């Protein structure tokens, strides 16, 4: 079939590839014992203003993301670089939860590369942003009958914000060449504008609570993981191992490599993890690809 004929001439022909398919899968996560405090982010009584968007750092905990994406309480749930259903299988070095309140019409502006008042002077996402934007209608909470003025957005700025940059200055914007010296007046504007949410507003102006999860997958040891249990350590066998999210296939063996205590893994010329430190029992394991090669007839 390789020669596409009902006749094979005398010779040797490379027909397929041989692989010692892995016998079993190995999961090795650190002995982590902390739950991620996502309640104080997704369950806060009062979210911060978009111009002073609140940021919380999540590290050294396990989060069951099934609850998050199985929830029907969200109107926007868009993950860029990632999917809601897969977070439970992963370990991340760090997560950032940025929370604030905007209006519905501005929700579209919270995305990588979006342009707008919010994306320009209030909160900017990078184009290579990896994470999830989760927004839900908070009309029942952030809307006052007389108008809620606790939420302010920056409407005047000299230049657009860098990604993940916060500016909380209340300095009077000087639209012209005449200095303002902290006095409101002609060509002198207060940069912060109140939303004034009211229950009678339309969907495009009702308050929306937005939480942006930024998952960072660096080379550093992972500290935020899903609810995944680690299996037993199998050596001298072809396995499908997973060390703190570092998935791979090979043979794990005890190694005489003298890792310094701060060191967690060693690489090869091809940036391939030649050895790892087991996250639970801090031993050094050599990783060697099981077996493979051409098959000739």
């Amino acid at each position: 079939c390789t020669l596409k004929s009902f006749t094979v001439e005398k010779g040797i022909y490379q027909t397929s590839n041989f692989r010692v398919q892995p016998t079993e899968s190995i999961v090795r996560f650190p002995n982590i014992t902390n739950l991620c405090p996502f309640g104080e982010v997704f369950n806060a009584t009062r979210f911060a203003s978009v111009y002073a968007w609140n940021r919380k750092r999540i590290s050294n905990c396990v989060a069951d993301y099934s609850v998050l994406y199985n929830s029907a309480s969200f109107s926007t749930f868009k993950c860029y670089g990632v999917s809601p259903t897969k977070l439970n299988d992963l370990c991340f070095t760090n997560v950032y939860a940025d929370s604030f309140v905007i209006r519905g019409d501005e929700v579209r502006q919270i995305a990588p590369g979006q342009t707008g008042n919010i994306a320009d002077y209030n909160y900017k996402l990078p184009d290579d942003f990896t994470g999830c934007v989760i927004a839900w209608n908070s009309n029942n909470l952030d809307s006052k009958v007389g108008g809620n003025y606790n939420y302010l957005y920056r409407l005047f700025r000299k230049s657009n914000l860098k990604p993940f940059e916060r500016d909380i200055s209340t300095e009077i914007y000087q639209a012209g060449s005449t200095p303002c010296n902290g006095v409101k007046g002609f060509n002198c504007y207060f940069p912060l504008q109140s939303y004034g949410f009211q229950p009678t507003y339309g969907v495009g102006y009702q308050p929306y609570r937005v939480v942006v999860l930024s998952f960072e997958l660096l080379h550093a040891p992972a500290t935020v993981c899903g609810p995944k249990k680690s299996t037993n350590l199998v050596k001298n066998k072809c396995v499908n191992f997973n060390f703190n999210g570092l998935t791979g296939t090979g043979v794990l063996t005890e190694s005489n490599k003298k890792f310094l205590p701060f060191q967690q893994f060693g690489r090869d010329i091809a940036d391939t993890t030649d050895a790892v430190r087991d996250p639970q029992t801090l031993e050094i394991l050599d990783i060697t690809p099981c077996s493979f090669g051409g098959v000739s007839v």
């Binding site: 490379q14 590839n17 860029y80 670089g81 990632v82 999917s83 259903t85 897969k86 299988d89 992963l90 290579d128 990896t130 997958l217 999210g245 998935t247 791979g248 296939t249 010329i269 091809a270 940036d271 391939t272 690809p289 090669g293 051409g294």
Partner: protein, 418 residues
Amino acid sequence: TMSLGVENSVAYSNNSIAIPTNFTISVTTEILPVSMTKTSVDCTMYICGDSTECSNLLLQYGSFCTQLNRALTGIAVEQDKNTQEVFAQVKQIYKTPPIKDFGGFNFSQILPDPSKPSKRSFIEDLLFNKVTFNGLTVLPPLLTDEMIAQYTSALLAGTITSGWTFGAGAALQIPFAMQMAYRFNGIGVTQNVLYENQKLIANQFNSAIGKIQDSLSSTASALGKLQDVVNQNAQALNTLVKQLSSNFGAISSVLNDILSRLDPPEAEVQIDRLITGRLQSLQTYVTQQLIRAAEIRASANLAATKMSECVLGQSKRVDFCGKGYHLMSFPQSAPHGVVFLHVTYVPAQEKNFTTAPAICHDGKAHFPREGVFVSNGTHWFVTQRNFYEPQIITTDNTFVSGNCDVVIGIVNNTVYDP
């Protein structure tokens, strides 16, 4: 401003000839790549290593991977063919006699060393000492280095023992000093010169071989031609491997990260970019490899031609088997290549003489059968062109043609009648 050589005004005139009175035996090294590393790439593993969804997406490109694999297979078979053609030029395996009675010539350092486990000579040991998981595999060469050494040894033995007869047909033994006499005749030197300076010639050859040994032992940049090739190959593979770290617009350069991070509808979008980038990189690598293989094939054809025309024969082509009048050559196997030790004859010490195109004896114009007429100031002799050996101008040294009213520069001298 660099100097172009040393300037030199030749002492040219219409009756002056410079003739060598001595000579030297030069052994020079020429190094030719013969083959490159036979590399195969699992296109599907390279692009979609162990990923079924990525392989399914990759199927959309038809037969791109299979023709890349075909190209690499052709390259590897071509490397094998190049080695075969360069080294398998001898029908039988000739082994030199235990008694090394070669007229003083010493081939100990180019002949295989029995002590070494491989049939490898001292110089080849120097040569081999000097030159130094993502679907990427290296196929071993068909002929082992020991086999190439065996071929080289057979070639050397046949050359030493039979001259150029074994290249044409059956090896006809001949004393090596008489073979050097034959080659002296071939370059235009009378063979009595070889016999009368046999010790000097042998000592010069041994000295040149020892100097070759010293140069190899000391300086390694000479083999750069081979090493260069290796480096190029290495570099390409490095490049290929490094491309797997490029996101090409995808969120990540790791397929496992995307698959464990993205749903199939979203995962496929990212995987497509990686497939595109890695496919383009593979195409680039295969193309440049084809070009380099073409270059190597040209080099190997040159090397096979040189083996034929310098080792199995004595070439009259200028500067094809080294600089100077070629005497012979000896092959030495090298990693992925070959080395030729060209033994050439270089005139060394030249004297000025007065010369004439012909000579008048009895109104007839006499011209040399072989050689040239010279004068040492008062007496006229006739000597062979490439070595000063004056002789009495007789009727056996010369031949008559016409009279003396035609030749421009003809001179008067007695032509002896034996």
